[PDB]
Design a binder for this molecule. Structure first.
Ligand SMILES: CC1(C)[C@@H](OC(=O)CCC(=O)O)CC[C@@]2(C)[C@@H]1CC[C@]1(C)[C@@H]2C(=O)C=C2[C@@H]3C[C@@](C)(C(=O)O)CC[C@]3(C)CC[C@]21C
Ligand SMILES: CC1(C)[C@@H](OC(=O)CCC(=O)O)CC[C@@]2(C)[C@@H]1CC[C@]1(C)[C@@H]2C(=O)C=C2[C@@H]3C[C@@](C)(C(=O)O)CC[C@]3(C)CC[C@]21C
Lengths: 463, 462
């Protein structure tokens, strides 16, 4: 008779088989999705805890709901570990740990700082921006950021460091936006630019750094911090931070600067505004399980171990980069200085959508990527590859050297099938039905999986 | 570093806190209609490798590879949801991605309205929850009141019951595009068939946020909004006893035709609601939450859980009866659902004194505005629910001692309230006075050991 202390294995075999298939697919796969990581077991033990059951609407100091005695201390702990993880000064920075995920963390900042229809700029979606930074199609508002607010994108300058900081400054003086976002998905270069904070300081905009993709790197000081230049920072606690899926908003606090007469030094106004956008306005009850798992990860990230990881992540990225040039690929202007690598595949003779589907069938998971020349729409000429997921499975430069030989056999199987096919589902069908290709893919799949299965995997053994 | 080390080993500080929260839960009595203790099965999924998987999109329409397995978990959760409530796949869909309750609501508004379009959500004191629409007399509070234009409630004051009259009058005036049949603190059924007239009148949309009653409806004990409503939202916690997540149910397929028009006239909810959740508001789904949600929906699609929902109402009824024979007055006269809103006005006790006393006694219920009320920091009534304790196998008898335990709370309160000045001066006197602090510790021990023996869902030690 139902106790609810039963195991998932006993009460829901259907779900336990599926957890187990997912676990096998991760262990046997080569995961190159720049935004994927494998979460620590420690973190998942918190994530899947009794903190699920506690409603704690409000914030630590006094948050009136009730018993929150212990969760208050978890939230403060998470706060302290957050500010420790990236460089201290609690005198000069605050943090909100309650955002449900990344998109909520951004919509919170917009909501706290701007009025509906206020003007926002971010790197356009195709040029490697996030959806939540704003995106309108020809005839549709697509991001909620573009619906509740007025978004104009700053494009990428095809071949250079790409982020046209020029065209930005030109258009940000014509558009008079009250917040500009500095953050990217598909970009191999450094930003979180002190020059964003000039373009901003100029036209009286707020600088928001969305560092979700590089947060681990920043956490580790293996790349330079947006927290010197930017006044608001948002991140996810997964990706390069390697925690559970949650979000963070960091904001400046205390006295901003001093000005005419004896002074009366002007105070920052973010803290209370961002905390009101998060709890009363947008979110109900925080997910205390996520907050705890986030706390576990942030401590992991404030350690010798995590600095070694993030250095290995850059060297692994460079390795995979150097390796692809060696066989003459083309990387979106140059190479990389971060966690990922954008391959241009038009000069090697294949698009992204074919390359992605071929690698998919050999247990290599990357994403197709629009290259500056946005024909776009599921047939872009690039491929986005990242090192963090595998670097967490103890891969080194030789391991990525070999990952790239497997991608090579993939690209090469593609070209071949691209020479007997009618572009669309006549390609995708041909990979299923053709006895010669179906076999050549199985053989490559089996080599990847044997290669993949041998490396350790964070998490539990079986789920 | 492997990332396979146990949390005990790698973070004792966090492991101690998980463990103190575990102590705290199994210890006390939880009567908050919005709270419940999650199954081990469900938590096993919540804390799985599904946390590791990005699957932006919907099953079949993904933007990444390597979703073969997550597709099936999402569809399973879909199916378990339509089955859980009973619901014909021809005539209903579900979206299982919402991160929580507030997102599920904002997603419906975003899919169905333009910014500044008009929303009638039962006001905060008359039922409530922020996400229905709430401005103070100085400022917009809920983001629903910022991005959309919200006009409050319609209840016959004192008479807890829903003014189906002045609503219909004002829904003919204010001309709102969507009305929210749903409640935080309301012990009665919402006439959904009469909402569907008020709404079919105004050419409005009917939304039910059935967060606290979600279990009951699947369980077929209460009448489902899913006969009258077009859109239904819920959290997967509370009454459903699952992980913190959110669901959005919506009608699909044909809506009948006029004689000559032929027969073409299909629902347009699905694509719009799904597009408001993925490109529009949310990034990647929390596949771990979806999995955990799926566990709970089955745990619940079953014989076992129809006798949870049957015991929940009768547990509620029992509590209701045993406060009419003592505790105070019954805002509504009684209950017909998972909770009772007792008035402490005719008992001469605020809602905020009575809440904070039971807190120090490890019983957590809710402060609740009642129609005879002042709007200051404290004043109102008391909101009780059967889902939490009903989960630790409590029956009607459990719910006579729990009520006698609350009586000792009410009664040490009244005593405190006759030797103290304001609330500030009241809640001081509970902490300071050696005579009262010991009288309270002795009641805390009686409720503690009444529950602490009882079984609780979860991992024993987190
Ligand atoms: C008077 C005001 C309008 C005002 O008062 C200020 O805060 C002034 C501060 C300032 O000057 O900035 C602004 C917000 C607020 C303080 C109150 C309204 C009532 C609460 C208290 C407001 C709040 O924030 C949070 C909630 C929550 C909603 C609830 C019941 C749920 O929805 O479940 C969960 C519990 C909780 C906390 C109680 C009820 C309200 C709606
Ligand atoms: C408008 C939509 C939502 C929609 O397309 C349309 O509706 C167009 C209108 C029409 O069809 O007419 C669906 C397909 C899509 C083309 C675009 C924009 C969103 C991207 C581009 C979609 C896509 O395929 C792949 C991703 C990826 C996710 C991301 C950011 C990551 O997760 O890191 C990695 C980079 C990348 C490429 C950026 C953003 C999206 C989600």
């Amino acid at each position: 008779g139902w106790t609810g202390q039963e195991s998932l294995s006993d009460s829901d075999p259907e779900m336990w088989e599926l957890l187990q298939r997912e676990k096998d697919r991760q262990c046997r796969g080569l995961e190159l999705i720049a935004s994927e990581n494998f979460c620590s077991r420690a973190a998942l033990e918190a994530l899947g805890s009794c903190l699920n059951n506690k409603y704690s609407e409000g914030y630590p100091g006094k948050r009136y709901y009730g018993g929150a005695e212990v969760v208050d201390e978890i939230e403060l702990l998470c706060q302290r570990r957050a500010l420790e993880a990236f460089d201290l000064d609690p005198a000069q920075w605050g943090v909100n740990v309650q955002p449900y995920s990344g998109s909520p963390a951004n919509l919170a900042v917009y909501t706290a700082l701007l009025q509906p229809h206020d003007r926002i700029m971010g790197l356009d979606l195709p040029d490697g921006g996030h959806l939540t930074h704003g995106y309108m199609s020809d005839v549709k508002r697509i991001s909620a950021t573009s619906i509740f607010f007025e978004s104009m994108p700053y494009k990428l300058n095809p071949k250079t460091g790409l982020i046209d900081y020029n065209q930005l400054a030109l258009t940000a003086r014509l558009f008079r936006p009250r917040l500009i976002i500095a953050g990217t998905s598909a970009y191999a270069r450094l930003i979180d630019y002190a020059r964003m904070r000039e373009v901003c300081d100029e036209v009286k905009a707020h600088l928001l750094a969305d560092m979700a993709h590089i947060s681990g790197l920043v956490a580790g000081k293996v790349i330079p911090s947006p927290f010197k230049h930017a006044d608001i920072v948002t991140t996810t606690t997964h990706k390069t931070l390697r925690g559970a899926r949650s979000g963070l908003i960091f904001y400046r606090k205390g006295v901003k600067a001093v000005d005419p007469k004896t002074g009366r030094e002007i105070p920052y106004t973010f803290e209370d505004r961002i905390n009101f956008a998060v709890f009363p306005s947008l979110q109900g009850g925080p997910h205390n399980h996520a907050i705890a798992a986030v706390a576990v990860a942030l401590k992991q990230a404030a350690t010798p171990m995590f600095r070694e990881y993030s250095l290995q992540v850059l060297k692994n990225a460079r390795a995979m980069a150097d390796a692809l040039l060696e066989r003459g690929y083309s990387l979106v202007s140059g190479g990389t200085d971060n966690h990922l690598v954008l391959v241009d595949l038009r000069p090697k003779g294949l698009d992204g959508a074919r390359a992605e589907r071929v690698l998919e069938l050999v247990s290599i998971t990357a994403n197709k990527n629009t290259c500056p020349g946005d024909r776009s729409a599921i047939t872009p000429g690039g491929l986005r590859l990242g090192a963090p997921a595998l670097t967490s499975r103890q891969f080194r430069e030789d391991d990525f050297r070999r990952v790239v030989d497997f991608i090579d056999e993939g690209v090469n199987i593609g070209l071949e099938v691209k020479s007997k096919t009618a572009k669309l589902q006549d390609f995708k069908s041909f990979l299923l039905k053709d006895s010669e290709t179906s076999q050549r893919l199985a053989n490559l799949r089996q080599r990847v999986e044997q290669f993949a299965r041998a490396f350790p995997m964070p998490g539990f053994d079986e789920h």
